Every structure is written in C-alpha cells, then in structure tokens.
Amino acid sequence: AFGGWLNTQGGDFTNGVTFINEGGSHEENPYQGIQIGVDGAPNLVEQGEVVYDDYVFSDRMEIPDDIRKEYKLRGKTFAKAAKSAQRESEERPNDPLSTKGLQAAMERIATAQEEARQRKEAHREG
Amino acid sequence: AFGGWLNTQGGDFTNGVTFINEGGSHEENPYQGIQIGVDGAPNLVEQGEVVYDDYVFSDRMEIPDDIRKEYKLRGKTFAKAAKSAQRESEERPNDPLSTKGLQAAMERIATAQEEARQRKEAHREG
Amino acid sequence: NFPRQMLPFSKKTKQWRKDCLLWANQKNYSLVRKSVIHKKINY
Amino acid sequence: AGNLRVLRLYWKSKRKILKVKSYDPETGEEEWNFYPENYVVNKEAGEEVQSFWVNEAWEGTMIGNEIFVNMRPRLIQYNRLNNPSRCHFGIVGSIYNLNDSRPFSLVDMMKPYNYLYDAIHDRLNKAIAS
Amino acid sequence: VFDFKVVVTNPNAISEIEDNKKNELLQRLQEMITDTSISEDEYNIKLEKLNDYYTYEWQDIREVRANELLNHYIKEYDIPLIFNNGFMDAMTCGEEIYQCDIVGGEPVIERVNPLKIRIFKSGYSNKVEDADMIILEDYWSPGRVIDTYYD
Amino acid sequence: DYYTYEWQDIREVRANELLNHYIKEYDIPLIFNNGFMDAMTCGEEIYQCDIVGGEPVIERVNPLKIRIFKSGYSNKVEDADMIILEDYWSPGRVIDTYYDVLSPKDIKYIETMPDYAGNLRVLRLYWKSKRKILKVKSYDPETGE
Amino acid sequence: DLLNGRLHMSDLELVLIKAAYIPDRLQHYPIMNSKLNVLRGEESKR
Amino acid sequence: TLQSSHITEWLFTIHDDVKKRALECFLETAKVALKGRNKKFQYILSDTSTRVMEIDGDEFAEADYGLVVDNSNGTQELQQKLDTLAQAALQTQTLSFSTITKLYTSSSLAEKQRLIEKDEKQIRERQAQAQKEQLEAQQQIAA
Amino acid sequence: TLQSSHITEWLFTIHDDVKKRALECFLETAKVALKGRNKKFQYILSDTSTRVMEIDGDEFAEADYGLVVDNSNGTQELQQKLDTLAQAALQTQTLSFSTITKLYTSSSLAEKQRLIEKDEKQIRERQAQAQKEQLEAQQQIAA
Ligand SMILES: [Mg+2]
Ligand SMILES: [Mg+2]
C-alpha cells in the first residue's frame, strides 16, 4: 500500500507510522471516518492524518511560525510534518538509529501539537 | 454435474457453491421443492437458485440499479450474480485466495439481497 | 509463439489454452542437463 | 503398438491479485490480505489496494492429436504460507552435477574404460581365433 | 534403513493460534459426537475416545495425520522400489525425477523417465521444482487414459 | 515455569528453535557438502543469507558468479565493501522474489522478451554506502551520569 | 571442468585441437574424483 | 570398506535429499486429495485426522506449520530413546501392555510421547487417590 | 588412518568455521524476518519466543548478547552429561517421564537444564510438605 510501509522481499515491514489514507473526511465518510480501533470506543480518523504510538497527528491544523522555528518543523500541517520527519525511517525500518530518531522526532511533533492546541484553546476561551 | 463442482482427476472438488438445478419451480414440483435438507424442516429450493453456506440466493428476484451500482453486481438476478461471482473459484477450489474472494463476494451479494428484501417488504407494507 | 500469459482470468479461454498446448506440441535445450542422445547411449 | 501419444504440459501462468491493507475493527492493527483481481476493495473503511501479478501453475493434456483434456490451473497448487507466488508442479527431482554444470555421472566416468576394455578384448578374441 | 517420518521440528513450541485451532477442532468433534450418539447410549463412549485428545496439540494432530498418510501409501505402493529405480537412473544419467499426482482420486507417485521430460526455463537451478515449464511426452495405453480421464 | 527462566535462556531457545526448524527444512547439511566440494575445487566457500517470500533462505554462491571488490587481503568474505552477483534466473524465480515491487511495465518487459534459454540476467549489487549520524551526549536527569 | 571430465589442451601446452578425436586430442582419466569424494563423504557423516 | 563407502556417500546423500523432497510433495498431494470426496481416507485416517482439513490453512505446505519429513540420526535416536523409555516404563508397573502395543504400532513419535504421558498421569493420580483413601479410612477408624 | 585424517583436518576445521559463521548469518536473517508480519513464525516458535522481538534489543547480533552458534567438544560433552544426568534422575523417582520426553525433544541445553531444575524443586517441595503433613497428623493424634 506504500503508506508508511516497506513491502519488499515478500515481507511487510513498518516503521511504526500509520498512514491512514483512502478513508475520507469525517463529514464525507458515512461512518464518520475509518474507525481504526476500539478503546473512547469510536476512534475515528480521516484521510490526511497519521498515527504513531497511538498518537494522532492532525492534518486540518496548521503550524504557527512561532512553533515552526522552535522544534524545527518542515510541513505546513502537523500531519505533513510527521510525513517529513519519518521519510528516512521508511526505507530502513530496522535500523536502531532510525527508530531512535523517529521516536525523538515524533515526541517533538507531539509536544508541538499539544502546545498549539493549548494556545488555540486558550485563545478561543479568551 | 458441472454446477459448482470440478470433477477432474478422479475426484469431486467443490468451491462451496451448490448449483441447485434439474428440479423445477416450486409450483411445478409435486413436493414443492427439492428438499435439500431438514433443519425449518422443509428446506425447499428450485432449479434457478444457488446456495453458499446455508444461505439462499433468490433467482426470481431482480437487482435494482441502485444495488447494481454499489456492491458492483453483474447478473440481472441475484442467482446469476453469484453464478458470475464464483466463476473464478470454480476452476480452482483449493486456492486460498479464491476461497477468500468467494467468501467476500458471497457476503456482499448476501447483504445486497437482504437490502433488496427489506426494501421490498417495506414498500409492500407501505 | 507462446500466447500471452499476462491476462485476466476471463480472457484465458478455451482457445487460449488450446494455443498453449499447440505450442507445446510444436516444441529441447537445457543448461544443466545432457542431451537425450547421451543419456540414451548410457542406458 | 496400439498406444496413444499422451502429451502433458505444465507451465507457470501469471495471475493478477490484490494486496489489501485493512484495519482490525477492534484494535488499531492494520492487516494484510491477498485477494484475486475480481475482489472489490471496500472503500469507506480505509482499505488500500495494490495490484500484483503472481505466478500460477497451469496444466493441460493432449491425447493423440484431437483430444484436449484438463486445461485449467493445477488443482494441486503447492502453496506457501506467506508467498502466493511460490508454486510448482508435482514433478520433483535433482541433477547430480557440480557447480552449475551438467552431470558427470558415474557411467560417464566409467565408460572410456569400458570402451577400452571392449577394444582390448576384441584383440584377445581375434588372437584366440587365429 | 528407510524410516521417513514426519516430525515436529520444535515439539515444545506452542502458540496461541495453535491452541485456537485445537479448540476449534475439539468443538467440531464435540458437535459431531453429539449428533451421532443416540441419547446417552454411546455419548460417553465418544467422550472417552476424545478425552485423550485434550492432551494433544495442533502440531501433534497434523503430524499424526501426515504420518498415517505417508505410512499407508509407502506400505501400499512399495515406494522404496521406486526410489531404487530412480537411484539407478541417477547413477546412469545424474538425473533423478519423480512426479506426484492425483489419479482416480488417490495420490500416486511415479518415476519420470529422464528421456521423456523436457525441462524449460530454469536458472542453472539444480532442483527440478524451480523450472517454470515441463512437458511429459509418453505413449500411454488406452486403458490408462480412460482410467485417468474418464470423468 | 517461565519464572525460572532467564533472558539469555529465552533468547537461546528462540534461536535454537529457528535454526533447528530451518536446518531440518532446507537440508543445510547438503548445502554445506556442496560448498565443501566447491572449496576443495577452488579454495573458496561462500554462502548468501537473504529473505525471499518473507522467510529466511540460505544459498550456496557459485565462485564463478560473485565479484568481490575492495577487500583488505582478508580471507573472509564479510570484510568486502562491494559485491556483484551476476546470474541467470528464470522468469518464475524473479516473479517469486519481486512480485511485491515489480511494476506492470516490468512484467510486460518480462512478457515481451523474444524468448528465443528464456532466462533473465539478474545482476544484484551490494555496496557499503556511508551515512551521516550524530553522536549526542546527554545527562541522565535523575543522576549526574 | 577437470572435475567434470573436460581437458583443455591449452592448459598443459601451446596448441600449434578443436576436433573431438584422440589422434590430435588427449584423453582425460578422472583419477582425482575419488580423492575429493572421500573427503566430501566424510564431511557428510561428521 | 568404510573409506570406500565415503566415495559414494555423496551420491547417497543427494539421493536421500531427493527422497525427502519427493515424500513432501506426495504428502501435499495427499492433503489436496483429502478434500475430494474420497472415502478411502475415512479408513486409513482417524476422526481428528479427517477434521484437520476442516480448519483453515490446510492449503499450505506442511513446512510452514513446523512439520518436515525427516530421515536423520536425530529422529532415529529419538525413536530408540522413546522405545527404551517405554520398555523401562513397563517395568516398575508404570505403563500398561495395551499402550505398549499402541507404541509398537504408532508410526508417530508425538503419539507415543502423549501415550506415555497419559499413562504416567493416570497411574500417578490412581496412586494419589489410593493413598488418600487409605489415610481417610485410618482416620475414620480412629474417630 | 588417523594420521592421514590429520592431513585434511585443516580443510575440515576451516569448513566448520565457515559453517558456524554461515549459521550465525542465517540466525540474524531469521531475526530480521521475524518482524515482517509472517505467520509461519507463529507455528515454529513459542509465545515467549515470539514476544522477545517486542523488546528494544532485537536489532543487534546475538553474539553481543552472549549467544553463539557452536559445535565443539564442550557442547557435545555438556549434552551427554545432561542426558546421562537426566537418565540417572529418572531412576530414584526424581524426574518424570513427561519431562524426560521434553528433554528428548528440546534442542536447547538451557531448556532441559531448566526442566531438570523445575522437577527437582517440585519434587522436593512435595516431599517436604508430605513430611510436614505426616508430622502434624501424628501430633494432632497425640493431642
Ligand atoms: Mg483405519
Ligand atoms: Mg509449533
């Protein structure tokens, strides 16, 4: 499927990133999304978002330049930033250094998204 | 019988679909049906219908174009749609991929027929 | 000429398989086998 | 004699199949499955589909010149668990060769000595006769 | 010595899927013995027969089935004679080939004459199974073609 | 009963399970016998380890079909930096090994070959590239280590 | 090739043939095969 | 003659390899033949052996399930060890003659292994319950 | 013939080294193949064996964890000692027939070692609690 996988030599190796594609927007999907799993039981996700370690990177949200400069993101959205941080890990999902780098980058992007959501929530309640 | 069976190499291999032919319509048969089994004890079937996993595809019914477009059916009657879905599996009953494809297609056609039946009875009761 | 084998299952009809068998009838060389004459001489 | 020429052909055809990435409904565990080309991918559920061409064993038998029998995929697909393309026919065998060469059988290495033996014993027979 | 037995490569290796398949088989057998047994007359006999299979494993049942198949057909067809003939042919040509097929609904194994097989599209492969195309041309009796292709 | 086990014991059990199963499955001893013959003939014995179809496989490499570059007078083959394996494969084998990556254009190329044997020249390149990696020095937060 | 019973006349002299006949070509007698066969057979039973 | 047998052990080794592969192919052919409505397999197979085919995954090679045809010193050694173990079990009144016959007519190493385990378990349980019966008999007599 | 075997034991020694290294190579190849979503490994491996990969140390060679493919006189001697020791343990009623079969079907020296230790501990605990139960029965009788 090529989404966060390296299907070669008759195997299916993944770097841990889940490219949740082909479903559609929350409003356009009759089931409100793909419904990857059951845990809140309705864990719904759309076409543009990506998941690492059960943490959802949102595509609708953008990256403030303040949060761009610190943590050194590249993409315009958080989903695109995760898709840019994990480019190296796709072709070498088994390398220990690649896994460590992916874990660190995903933690950075998760903290950035938490900060952005906190800022937006505070501003909206303001 | 050549209906849903591959009698070759001195064996009798089946893909699971039961071509129920040669009996006749319910009204033309003095026992009202072929009486395949006893379970409702009178399990009756006619010449046009086919069975896969103890569930009956009706030959008398027709697929509305709405149900043709989605679930992507081919035959004009539900029985003919299953006679079209199982063609690839008839020549290779022992292939795992063929069995899985038959399982999925049979589920799709069964759900389509259930939707047609509930629509028809709802319209009739209206 | 051996007929094309990169086809959907629907287009692998009776005439296609008959063409395969006719090619087989029309027919040896191998890289790790001796000639048939050599084997026959041995036997 | 009153026999029939029976020519049986075995060949690996190529079959189009689909690898479908579907998510487990209960747990967030993406899964993989192999289906034929006629399988309709279930959209609206995240089922990503990619199509591959894969080996498939076929057979067919000609009896005499007019009879055509059992033209179909081999019903004995010697399949493997993870590789849909690993298949073969019922024929199993080996070459008793060395380093990708043709077999230098035991009879091959003994044959020159046998030919020399025959020549020498022909000389012996002529000497006995004379 | 000719003792070719199917053996579990790791007999002390059990996983969840094996246990699930064992449970499925036991449930199926329980339903069948419930169906056939006529109201307690021999139901306990079936429980006695299947109670010793709770200590079995999926791998053990599969190995058992394989061993009974191979043992029966080895004792039936006298396969070692077939292997001896193939060994002589290997000595003569350096090629040992056997064909396994279903004839009359039963599995059969035959020795292929090296002069009556055409192996095409191999990659310097020592094994015959790696070939992509094989032709077997032999003159059969009418009885054999009817015994194989009556259906 | 696994409470009495140790980490090293569990790893050893897993490794023994793998080697046991695959040694019995592949008849690795016959492969080693052939390699011993190749070594007596050439003074060279080589084996390739790879994954094919998702399973580990082991093969004996023809000494005439492996090109070893950039070695350091080392009698071992693992010390090499660039290896080229040129051999002729059947179409069935290449489709068995590369179905998940072969494109329809490539499969048509396999079809459209004249096929006057009908094998395919499979050249596989192995070479040690270089990667830029970072050695980062960090202090344990709890203890000044 | 020597182990497979082929003698290259260009490997033991200057060729002043390509015809598979003894009046100008040289027989090969495989006396080395047994020596290597013993060792490979011992390798199997170790 | 041993050093002469070394000269042809290569031929015999490749022969045994070919035999193993041929038997594996025949095993797969028989597996496919089972699902063909042949009543012969109802006689040479037991019940559970005939219900293995009902479970999914029977279409694949047995080498992918951990089963391999094997003729090596390991399996022959294991068979010998199991047979002497059973003989030692007969002595000490631990293993019953009926099950000894079953082992002698088993053809599968795991089958005989489970038979030995079953009889050990049965005998040990019978000993334990007999001991408990004697102890409670003494206790109630004293009471 | 022994002094003639010395002449080719150098070939055999380097061959053994090559075989050892090739088997380490195959072991690492299988380790990488484990984490590729193949259902074959679920059949030939146990649950703990399939769970080892979840720890963050599986990407490195087994030689770095104290594990080596080895065929030397040390391992054969250790195997023979363990097997003979288990045979001696069977007699004296210190090791069960089922666990004997498990040792015969282990392939790992560590596994059979742990089996022997577990059986020792279980039987000693049962013996000790037997003495305690008998002693308290006598004591309460006297009371
Ligand atoms: Mg019977
Ligand atoms: Mg297992």
Neighbours of D71 (CB within 10 A): 20
Neighbours of I115 (CB within 10 A): 23
Cα–Cα dist E75/H105, whole Å:
14
Residues whose CB is less than 8 angstroms from the CB of residue D7 and which lie 6 or more positions away in sequence, other chains included = C21, C24, C25, D61, D62, D63, E135, E136, E137
Cα–Cα dist A37/D25, whole Å:
6
Task: Judge: F91–E9 Cβ closer than 8 Å, yes or no.
Answer: no
**Any CB–CB contact under 8 A between B27 and chain H?**
no
Q: What is the dihedral sign for C-alpha H132, H133, H134, H139?
A: positive
**G13-25 burial, b if ≥16 CB within 10 A, otherwise e?**
eeeeeeeeeeeee
For chain D, give the secondary structure using H, E and C: CCCEEEEEEEEEEEEEEEEEEEECCCCCCEEEEEEECCCCCCCCCCCEEEEEEEEEEEEEEEECCCEEEEEEECCCCCECCCCCCCCCCCEEEEECCCCCCCCCCHHHHHHHHHHHHHHHHHHHHHHHHC
How remote is the CA of residue H115 from the centroid of ligand 1, in Å? 18
Cα–Cα dist A81/A61, whole Å:
11
Q: D95: which strand partners?
A: E95
Query: What tokens does E121 get?
Result: 């599209």
Cα–Cα dist H76/H66, whole Å:
19
DSSP code at position I53: G
Going from the C-alpha of B46 to that of each of B75, B82, B88, G31, I83, the distances in angstroms are 18, 16, 24, 79, 69
Q: D8: which strand partners?
A: D61, E136
Instruction: Please report residues of D whose CB lies closer than 8 A to that of E107.
Output: none
Question: In terms of Cα–Cα distance, which of F32, I112, B9 is closest to E100?
Answer: B9
Task: Judge: D7–C24 Cβ closer than 8 Å, yes or no.
Answer: yes
Neighbours of B111 (CB within 10 A): 12
DSSP code at position B58: P
Probe site for chain F from H10, H11, H15, H75 (most F CB atoms < 10 A): H10
Longest dimension (CA), chain B: 55
- Please answer whether residues A1 and D21 qualify as being in contact, where contact means their C-beta atoms are separated by less than 8 angstroms: yes
User: CA A64, A69, A73: angle at the middle one, nearest 5?
Assistant: 75
Cα–Cα dist E57/E16, whole Å:
11
Longest dimension (CA), chain G: 49
C-alpha dihedral over F129, F135, F141, F142, to 10 degrees? 80
- Please answer whether residues E137 and E115 qualify as being in contact, where contact means their C-beta atoms are separated by less than 8 angstroms: no
Query: What tokens does I118 get?
Result: 């577990």
Residues whose CB is less than 8 angstroms from the CB of residue H104 and which lie 6 or more positions away in sequence, other chains included = none
**Any CB–CB contact under 8 A between F4 and chain I?**
yes
Residues whose CB is less than 8 angstroms from the CB of residue F63 and which lie 6 or more positions away in sequence, other chains included = D99, F38, F42, F44, F46
Cα–Cα dist D6/E140, whole Å:
6
> Got the DSSP string for A49-100?
-EEETTEEEPSSSB--HHHHHTTT--SSBHHHHHHHHTHHHHH-TT-HHHHH
User: CA I38, I42, I48: angle at the middle one, nearest 5?
Assistant: 125
Question: In terms of Cα–Cα distance, which of E119, E120, E109, E118 is closest to E85?
Answer: E109
Cα–Cα dist B93/B88, whole Å:
9
SS3 B126: coil
- Please answer whether residues F50 and E39 qualify as being in contact, where contact means their C-beta atoms are separated by less than 8 angstroms: no
Cα–Cα dist B65/B72, whole Å:
10
How remote is the CA of residue F66 from the centroid of ligand 1, in Å? 54
DSSP code at position F62: P
> Got the DSSP string for I10-34?
HHHHHHHHHHHHHHHHHHHHHHHHH
Question: In terms of Cα–Cα distance, which of I91, I89, I92 is closest to I119?
Answer: I89
Cα–Cα dist E68/D81, whole Å:
23
Please report where in the chains the tokens 């194994």 appear, as a residue.
Answer: E109
**E41-63 burial, b if ≥16 CB within 10 A, otherwise e?**
eeeeebeeebeebeebbbbbbbb
**Any CB–CB contact under 8 A between G41 and chain I?**
no
Cα–Cα dist I12/I5, whole Å:
10
Question: In terms of Cα–Cα distance, which of H33, I58, B36 is closest to E104?
Answer: H33
Instruction: Please report residues of D whose CB lies closer than 8 A to that of C17.
Output: 58, 60, 68, 71-72
Classify residue E22 by burial, with Cβ atoms within 10 Å: 0-12, 13-18, 19+: buried
Residues whose CB is less than 8 angstroms from the CB of residue C7 and which lie 6 or more positions away in sequence, other chains included = C16
Cα–Cα dist D32/A11, whole Å:
11
Q: Does chain B reach chain D with at least 3 CB pairs under 8 Å?
A: yes
Instruction: Please report residues of D whose CB lies closer than 8 A to that of C25.
Output: 7, 62
SS3 B104: helix
Q: Nearest C-alpha of chain B: how many angstroms from D2? A: 24
CA atoms within 13 A on the CB side of B80: 10
Cα–Cα dist B20/B49, whole Å:
6
Helices B78-85 and B96-125, interaxial angle, to 10°?
170
Helix ranges (H only) for chain I are 2-34, 41-44, 47-51, 73-90, 97-104, 109-142
Cα–Cα dist B119/B98, whole Å:
31
For chain C, give the secondary structure using H, E and C: CCCCCECCHHHCCHHHHHHHHHHHHHCCCCCCCCCHHHHHHHC
Going from the C-alpha of A40 to that of each of A36, A37, A82, D26, D28, the distances in angstroms are 12, 9, 24, 12, 12
Going from the C-alpha of D75 to that of each of A87, B8, B94, E120, the distances in angstroms are 44, 9, 6, 21
- Please answer whether residues D4 and D63 qualify as being in contact, where contact means their C-beta atoms are separated by less than 8 angstroms: yes
Looking at residue F103, its amino acid is S
Q: Does chain I reach chain E with at least 3 CB pairs under 8 Å?
A: yes
Classify residue F15 by burial, with Cβ atoms within 10 Å: 0-12, 13-18, 19+: buried
For residue H86, what is the enclosing H or E element? helix H73-90
For E89-151, give the secondary structure using H, E and C: HHHHHCEEEEEEEEECCEEEEEECCHHHEEEECCCCCCECCCCCEEEEEEEECHHHHHHHHCC
Helix ranges (H only) for E2-107 are 16-36, 43-51, 58-77, 79-93
Looking at residue G42, its amino acid is E
Neighbours of B121 (CB within 10 A): 10
Counting every residue written for chain I, the total comes to 143
Residues whose CB is less than 8 angstroms from the CB of residue H80 and which lie 6 or more positions away in sequence, other chains included = none
Instruction: Please report residues of B whose CB lies closer than 8 A to that of H60.
Output: 96
Looking at residue I108, its amino acid is S
DSSP code at position F61: P
Q: Does chain A reach chain D with at least 3 CB pairs under 8 Å?
A: yes
Going from the C-alpha of B126 to that of each of B58, B120, B122, F105, the distances in angstroms are 23, 10, 6, 56
Which structural technique was applied? cryo-EM
Q: Nearest C-alpha of chain I: how many angstroms from F46? A: 8
Question: In terms of Cα–Cα distance, which of H25, A88, E21, A87 is closest to D90?
Answer: H25
Please report where in the chains the tokens 């179809």 appear, as a residue.
Answer: F53
Neighbours of H102 (CB within 10 A): 15
- At residue D62, φ and ψ (nearest 5 deg) are -110, 130
Query: What tokens does E12 get?
Result: 């002390």
Ligand nearest to the CA of E10: 2
- Please answer whether residues H7 and G36 qualify as being in contact, where contact means their C-beta atoms are separated by less than 8 angstroms: no
- Please answer whether residues B26 and B33 qualify as being in contact, where contact means their C-beta atoms are separated by less than 8 angstroms: yes
Query: What tokens does C28 get?
Result: 């040896």
Task: Judge: E105–B8 Cβ closer than 8 Å, yes or no.
Answer: no
Cα radius of gyration rounded to whole Å, chain F: 22
Cα–Cα dist H49/H58, whole Å:
12
Q: A55: which strand partners?
A: A52
- Please answer whether residues D40 and D31 qualify as being in contact, where contact means their C-beta atoms are separated by less than 8 angstroms: no
Q: Is A85 left (phi over 0), alpha (psi -120 to 50) or beta?
A: alpha
Ligand nearest to the CA of E9: 2
Q: D54: which strand partners?
A: D15
Nearest CA in chain D to B12: D75
- Choose among F24, F25, F30: nearest Cβ to H17: F30
**I118-140 burial, b if ≥16 CB within 10 A, otherwise e?**
ebeeeeeeeeeeeeeeeeeeeee
Cα–Cα dist I38/H73, whole Å:
31
Residues whose CB is less than 8 angstroms from the CB of residue I115 and which lie 6 or more positions away in sequence, other chains included = I99, I102, I103, I106
Nearest CA in chain I to D31: I37
SS3 I134: helix
Cα–Cα dist F24/B94, whole Å:
27
Give residue ranges of I with CB < 8 Å to any E CB: 39, 42-47, 49-50, 102, 105-107, 111
Residues whose CB is less than 8 angstroms from the CB of residue H95 and which lie 6 or more positions away in sequence, other chains included = H86, H89, H116, H119, H120, H123
Cα–Cα dist E104/E82, whole Å:
20
CA atoms within 13 A on the CB side of E102: 26
How remote is the CA of residue H46 from the centroid of ligand 1, in Å? 6
Task: Judge: F111–C31 Cβ closer than 8 Å, yes or no.
Answer: no
- Choose among D53, D80, D99: nearest Cβ to F99: D53
**Parallel, antiparallel, or unpaired for β B50-52 and B17-19?**
antiparallel
Task: Judge: B6–D33 Cβ closer than 8 Å, yes or no.
Answer: no
Query: What tokens does C43 get?
Result: 């036997």
- Please answer whether residues B73 and B109 qualify as being in contact, where contact means their C-beta atoms are separated by less than 8 angstroms: yes
C-alpha dihedral over D83, D88, D93, D99, to 10 degrees? -50
Task: Judge: D28–A10 Cβ closer than 8 Å, yes or no.
Answer: no
Query: What tokens does A47 get?
Result: 């076409």
Helices E43-51 and E16-36, interaxial angle, to 10°?
160
Cα–Cα dist A70/E28, whole Å:
62
Residues whose CB is less than 8 angstroms from the CB of residue I47 and which lie 6 or more positions away in sequence, other chains included = E14, E15, E16
Looking at residue F12, its amino acid is E
Q: What is the dihedral sign for C-alpha I74, I80, I83, I84?
A: negative
Helices F28-42 and H2-34, interaxial angle, to 10°?
140
Cα–Cα dist H38/H1, whole Å:
49
DSSP code at position H55: S
- Please answer whether residues D34 and B97 qualify as being in contact, where contact means their C-beta atoms are separated by less than 8 angstroms: yes
Residues whose CB is less than 8 angstroms from the CB of residue D31 and which lie 6 or more positions away in sequence, other chains included = D21, D22, D23, D24
Cα–Cα dist A75/F15, whole Å:
43
**Any CB–CB contact under 8 A between D16 and chain F?**
no
Cα–Cα dist E136/E128, whole Å:
13
**What is the layout of strands, in order, in the sheet containing E95-103?**
D91-95, E95-103, E106-111
- Please answer whether residues F63 and A19 qualify as being in contact, where contact means their C-beta atoms are separated by less than 8 angstroms: no
Instruction: Please report residues of B whose CB lies closer than 8 A to that of E145.
Output: none
Please report where in the chains the tokens 């052919």 appear, as a residue.
Answer: H29
